[PDB]
Design a binder for this molecule. Structure first.
Ligand SMILES: CC(=O)N[C@@H]1[C@@H](O[C@@H]2O[C@H](CO)[C@H](O)[C@H](O)[C@H]2O)[C@@H](O)[C@@H](CO)O[C@@H]1O
Length: 152
């Protein structure tokens, strides 16, 4: 199983930083959206559903540093409160075609709300396949804004 970020080189496990551009001004009660489906893609390394990969997001994925913030996480058509207090539903990947991860993060903050370059969220993703032991792998996506976000 492989992933990549903005068409970079392939990733088998571990922590990767994911840089997003955000709206530089937000208002109280307004909701900030981070669409990760534009950035991260994954695929089956053999194709044909021969050794199918099963991926989900993991309990304990949270805001970093922004722990008082409210949020939601959209994953594979379902909305979960964020931070994740349970694992998400499983996405099956069997083709050698990069599939955008169907993942969005909704943030309600509660001056500068997000600093450029600071980790905003740490999202734990788990993979296991079908044959042998399934060769389980853990990925952490460190979500980071290219610009500060301010609220009047
Ligand atoms: C047996 C092995 O290590 N194979 C490598 C591939 O990994 C596997 O891929 C399948 C389908 O994605 C499944 O996830 C297995 O659990 C996993 O072992 C893959 O890493 C490729 C990359 O070119 O190299 C070997 O084929």
């Amino acid at each position: 199983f492989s992933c990549n970020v903005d068409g970079g080189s392939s990733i088998g496990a571990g922590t990767t930083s994911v840089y997003v551009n955000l709206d530089p001004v937000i208002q109280p009660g307004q909701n900030l959206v981070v669409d990760l489906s534009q950035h991260i893609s994954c695929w089956n390394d053999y194709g044909g559903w021969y050794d199918t990969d099963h991926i989900n997001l993991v309990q304990g994925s949270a805001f970093a540093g922004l722990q008082s913030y409210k949020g939601s996480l959209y994953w594979n058509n379902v909305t979960y409160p964020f931070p994740l207090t349970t694992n998400t539903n499983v996405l099956d990947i069997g083709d050698k075609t990069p599939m955008p991860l169907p993942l969005k993060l909704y943030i309600t903050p509660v001056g500068v709300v997000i600093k450029a370059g600071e980790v905003i969220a740490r999202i734990h993703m788990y993979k296991i396949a079908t044959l042998g032991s399934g060769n389980p792998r853990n990925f952490t996506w460190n979500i980071i804004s290219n610009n500060s976000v301010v609220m009047p």
